[PDB]
Structure formats: structure tokens, C-alpha cells
Amino acid sequence: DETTYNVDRSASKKYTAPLLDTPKTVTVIPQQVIKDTGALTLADALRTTPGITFGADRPFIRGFNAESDTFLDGMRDVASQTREVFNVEQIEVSKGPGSAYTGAGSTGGSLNLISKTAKQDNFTDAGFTWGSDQTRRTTLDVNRMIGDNAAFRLNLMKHDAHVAGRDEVSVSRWGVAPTVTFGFDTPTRATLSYYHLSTDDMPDYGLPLTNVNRSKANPSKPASVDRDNFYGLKDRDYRKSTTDSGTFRIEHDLNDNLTLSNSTRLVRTTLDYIVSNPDDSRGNVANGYVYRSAKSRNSTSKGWVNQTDLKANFETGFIKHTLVTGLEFSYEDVHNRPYAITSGGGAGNTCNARLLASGDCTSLNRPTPGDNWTGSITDGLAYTDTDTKTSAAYVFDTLKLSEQWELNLGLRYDDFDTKSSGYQTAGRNGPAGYFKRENNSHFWNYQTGLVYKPAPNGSIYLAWSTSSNPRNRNLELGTKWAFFDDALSLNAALFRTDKTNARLQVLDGEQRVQGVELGFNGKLTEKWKVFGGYTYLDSEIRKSTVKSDEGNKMPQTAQNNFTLWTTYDLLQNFTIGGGTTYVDKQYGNTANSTYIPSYWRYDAMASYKVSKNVDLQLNVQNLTDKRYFDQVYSTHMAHVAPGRTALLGVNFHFSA
């Protein structure tokens, strides 16, 4: 049912077993959790499952970068789309050994964002939300059956807000997503989808890190200043993105046991921004000042991805196979020409009276984003054109050997060719001039998972995955249980992942994360639902060209992470909910010389049924107004999370 906290199967056809019998850690963040937590961004939704951090807006899973392992309906994210939540059905987070997706050389760790599709139902949902942070949000979700064999769904969203506890920072976005499906209850089914999102935000890099005598024995943390402090310029800084995506998927049953599909997606994105890096390690923070160091982008990206898959059920003697095999091809072209941004207050990286007067610099303690900035912006001379092609081939099979034993096997090949060219100015990469760069690589990935079922509702598994690139290994021992006629899932795993060239920047040695993960989701009782988990991550740089890094923690990795969301149906009329998250300290670099501290955050919810068609929902996020950081960089800065926000929604819902 639609309200479940416990989804028992992936929406991806690439899974050859239900989640209970899939030998890896996988958690689906379902629609009802997204709604009940009031999550408005993918990051808000991801925090409900443990082990996810962010670095570089790239997701890190159990301590390893997962940017190239983010998928949209199972397809490679060509041209790097921005999504929100208004068109999201659910988010699948995989951590265990192996990937069902094409990640090049990935031995595990993926996010798959599942888009809303048209249902065989008639409904209309509309939401209006007001916030203490000036949130004004309107959504519409309308779904209509067309006879017995087709349907249409349309999702619309408009959203404006300030950011609680960040001076002068605002966000705005809107989106539209129509989709149609042809062929329910027929041998051939096709879906056509379109997605558009536009954003227009004040970009915010947070607070500067200190940078005096930085070392492992004297690590840099964020400056100890008001966490409301914003170092950007209202009159200069902005971030505007557009996302346009069109998808055509068709599948055909050749018989009851064999289905062929082909999916094609075309994407265009743009990203235009100017953002202020707070001092860019230029030495002014020590003296109480911040140089608003402008960074920019002005890019257009175009992409396409095509997948062709076969899925089959068949028997070889007593063994039952569920098999999926396919090919993926993609192409992406990116053109970027950053701006040339010139100081209004003369030369140099060191704050002085001229640069304070021009708005190029400001006070560390009391920055004034309203400053009138007297610099200039033009198109820069430097530009880059980057073309990336990928190919992948894969076969996955779950072999049921008996009622108690299953073997999962997978093999994938991936290849990658990336070509960049353009013009560079004099700096890091050499003298000014034209450049051309190519890299081409391939990987074989192997996965094996043995599953024992001591009872129908239980699994014990041992799995491993390795990747070769002409010794990345991921290993996991785990158990999964389903209780109360599949209303509650409980999961536990012990794992170790080794990489030699973890990432971007590539290390030359060995990195290891090992630990334990617990997961729980579903109903404790008829009225009481839970969702969350716990992970302990022991990370280590085992070998490095920088000797002093050996033994250090991996960056972007919290040793402990606890997250719990729960709701209780107090009355037939009234539901309450609450959330608790703990994230341990994170280092920003392999030297462990930058960091942000641990924190606890608490959230609350109440929902009142006004009528059968109208709910009133209150969400209070970060109810103690804890001021914490949700990203640390290897240098320069740390990102400040929002303070307390209260959101009140009126949610209308009408069904046939």
C-alpha cells in the first residue's frame, strides 16, 4: 500500500530478487517517508538512512564518493540533472557489494532516483505550504486513467523561500513533469516522460575554515563566528540552473518468461553562477577579514543515454534462474566559459581599505551582503568543451538452488572515453594556450552473493564484488528479516571495502572502510511506524605516497551515524511524528587537518485530518535550532546547515 515505510522490491528491473533475498545492503526511501518528513530536497530525504555524507554536492556512501553512481530511473545521469522531490516516487540507496547499475569500476554504493509514473487510478493531490523561513510552496499531482490501457500524470511545483539562519540567502525553483503510459495489461508497454526544473538561488559556501598552523595536531575548523553569517553579495552572486529531460521506454513480452526493453533519454542542462568563496585561504580570516573570492560557471550540457535489456525466467535442471542482461551507451557534451571577474578595489589578495570600500572584502565577524560591489564581470577568454562516451554490458542472475539456498552472480564491463579541449589562461595547468586532453579506460566487475534462508522470511548472506582495470574489493556478511507478514524489515550487516585509488583527486595507495550497519523500517504495531538505521564506519588510509596520511581517517566519513524517524497514529484523526539524527565528526582531507564537529538534530511532525480530502501538516525541522555544518571541504570553507524551520501545509487529496 502507498503509505508503507517498508518497500519489499526495487523499482529497478535490474534486481533479480526481492530485497529480502538480495545479498547487499539496500534501503528504499519510500514516498510516504518523503511526505511525512516534509523533505523538500534530495539531501533532506537522504538523511533518513545512515552512512551518506556530501563533499566536492557529490554524495559519499560509506566513506566513498558516489557521484558517478547516481542514477535516474536506473540510467546514467548524463549532463548531471538537478532533481527535487516533487517528481520523485522513491529513492533507492544501495551500499552492499556489487551494483545493479553501470557505475564504471564501482564495487557498490549507488543512489537511484525513481521518478513518478502514471498509475491506473484517478487522483488529484494539491499542497500549499507556508514556512517560518518565508517558504511559499505549491504542488499539484494529477493522475488520470485513459481507458483500461493508458494513463497520464502531471506534476507541478513552485517554491520560494529564505534559508533559516543564513543571512540574505534565498532559493526559488519551479518544475513541470508530464508522463504518459501506453499499454497496461498488454504485451507491449511504453512510457513517455518529460521533466523540466528551473532554479534561481543565492549560492552559499558557508563559513571560512581557519588556516593558520594547519596540521593534524592543530586542525582547522570553521571560524567561531555567528552561524547566520553570509559572505556573498546580494548584488553579484547567483546560481541559475535549468534541467530538461525527455525519456522514451518501451518493453515487450516475447513470451510469459522473456521481456525485451529499450530506453532512451535526452537531456539538456544549463548552469550559470557566481558565488563567493569566503577568503579562499588568502590569509585575511586570521586578521578578521574575508575576501569575497568570486568563482563562476557558465555552462551548457547535452546528453543521451540508451539502454537495451533482456529479462528472463528459466530453468536449468532443478535450478531456477532469474536473469537480466543488457547494454548501455551514453554520450555527454559540456561547454563551459567562466566569467572574468575583476576587483573594484585594486589588485592583491590581502584586504585593505580600498577593497573593503569596493565590496570585494568584508568583516569576518559582521559581513554585510548588502554591500555595493564596484567590480566588473565579462565573458572570460578560457573555455572548455568536454565530450564523454560510455559503453557498458552486464549480466546478472539469481539462481535458486533449493528452497534454502540461492546464488547470485553478476558480470559487468564498462568503458569510458573522455575528451576535453579549449583555451586556458596562465596558471596551474601551464602557460596560456590551447589544450586537448583524452582519457580512455575500461573495467571488469564481478559479483557473487550466496544466500541462505533459515526460514521463508529470513536471509543470511555473504557477498563480494571486485573490479579490475587493465584490488578494489567489497565484502559483506549480512542478515535480513521480515516480520508481521512483511510489515517490518530488520537488517544487519558487517562489511569491509578496500580501494587502491579512491577519489576529483586520486590517491596512490590503499583505503579501507569496515564496519557495521543496522536498518529498520516498517510497522512496530498497527499505529507505530519506524524508519532508520545505524552505521559504524572504521575508515583508514592504509597506504599513501604521503607517509603522514597513513593511519588517518578518510575524509567525508563519520564514524557513527544514527537516524530514526517514527510516526504514531494517536487518534484516527491525528498523527504525530519525530526524528533524531546523530552524525559524528568529519574530516575534510586525508591529512585530517580540517574538520567539522558532530551534532544531534531533532525533528517533529503533526498531521490533522480536517476531512477525508484535506490534511493539515506541521513539520518542525531542527527543533532545537542546533547550528551545525553538513559539509566540510578539504580547504577554504564549511557549509552551514539551516537553523530551525516550521512548515505548515494544507494537503488536498481527491481520489476516484
Ligand SMILES: CCCCCCCCOCCOCCOCCOCCO
Ligand atoms: C537569466 C539571467 C542570468 C543572469 C542572472 C544574474 C543576475 C541574477 O538575477 C538578476 C536579477 O535579480 C533580480 C532579483 O533577484 C532576487 C533573488 O536573486 C537570487 C539570485 O538570482
Ligand SMILES: CCCCCCCCOCCOCCOCCOCCO
Ligand atoms: C528518443 C528519446 C527522447 C524522446 C522523449 C519524448 C518525451 C515526450 O514526453 C511527453 C510526455 O507526455 C506529455 C503529455 O503532454 C503534457 C503536456 O503538459 C502540459 C502542461 O500543461
Ligand SMILES: CCCCCCCCOCCOCCOCCOCCO
Ligand atoms: C547470458 C545472457 C543471455 C541468456 C538469455 C537466456 C534467456 C532465454 O530464456 C528463454 C525463456 O524461456 C522461453 C520459454 O520457451 C517456451 C515458451 O513457453 C511459453 C511461456 O509461457
Ligand SMILES: CCCCCCCCOCCOCCOCCOCCO
Ligand atoms: C562465463 C561468463 C559469461 C556469463 C554468461 C551467462 C550465461 C547465462 O547463464 C545461463 C545458464 O545456462 C548454462 C547451463 O547451466 C547448466 C547448469 O546445470 C548443469 C548441472 O546439472
Ligand code: NA
Ligand atoms: Na536575482
